[PDB]
Amino acid sequence: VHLTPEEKSAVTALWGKVNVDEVGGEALGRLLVVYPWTQRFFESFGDLSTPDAVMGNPKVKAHGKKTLGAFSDGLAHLDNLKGTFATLSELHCDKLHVDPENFRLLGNVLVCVLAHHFGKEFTPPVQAAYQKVVAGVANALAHKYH
């Protein structure tokens, strides 16, 4: 992605304050509550029946953590999102059968969680930078679909 000097520093400074453990568990839990059809990929997680159920589900929590950690490695290679996520891309297509559209939804929920967590620190210009990041991460994940 193309980020201005101001945008790169915005993204980077905020990420430093994030605990992946908990921002991950939140973003995934919220994906499963707000867009219930995404629950189709997680039948083995168990009870995703109530907002309280999804949020307290430990499998959701472990998974959200796994996802965000991979996401974290990408920030470090913002210059080549495509090359970085190629392996995971093939995996999500060939073995998992995840419609890439889901990537976009996750991106949007993550922005929401950053806003909620940080409040007024998460300003318009910070948002915009993070919108570019997520969109580029989503395109990187969908890249090897065929």
């Binding site: 707000v34 867009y35 219930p36 059809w37 995404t38 629950q39 189709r40 297509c93 059968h97 995840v98 419609d99 890439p100 559209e101 889901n102 969908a142 679909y145 065929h146």
Partner: protein
């Protein structure tokens, strides 16, 4: 919302489909799978090679449901009821994909109905597939 003119337009064009609905439904799907490859993520369990029985069957299922929607156009929600529940609770197809199938059904129809696919029928058809899609998606959340 569909005007009366729209309903006349849809019933007329779908009339001509008549007996080919099932073959049209197969061609639209095959066009979807080829132009929009991500839609294949929902048919991992299908043999998606051209002319497969699975596609032709499914194609026929999809067309029957459109015909039904055409017959009960003044009351779509009630007619597609069972179909909304299935897509909402079981299949769980992301709403974006209905748009891509809608588009390939329109290309199918243009290609087979030279005489009838006027500007005004095209608009009515497009509004019609948008309502069907809205119905099919109405119980997602």
């Amino acid at each position: 919302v569909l005007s009366p003119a729209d309903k006349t337009n849809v019933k007329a064009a779908w009339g001509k489909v008549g007996a080919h609905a099932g073959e049209y439904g197969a061609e639209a799907l095959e066009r979807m799978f080829l132009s929009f490859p991500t839609t294949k993520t929902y048919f991992p369990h299908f043999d998606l090679s051209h002319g497969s029985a699975q596609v032709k069957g499914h194609g026929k299922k999809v067309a029957d449901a459109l015909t039904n929607a055409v017959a009960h156009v003044d009351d779509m929600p009630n007619a597609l009821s069972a179909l909304s529940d299935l897509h909402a609770h079981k299949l769980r197809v992301d709403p974006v994909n209905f748009k891509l199938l809608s588009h390939c059904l329109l290309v199918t129809l243009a290609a087979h109905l030279p005489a009838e696919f006027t500007p005004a029928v095209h608009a009515s058809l497009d509004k019609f597939l948008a309502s069907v899609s809205t119905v099919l998606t109405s119980k997602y959340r």
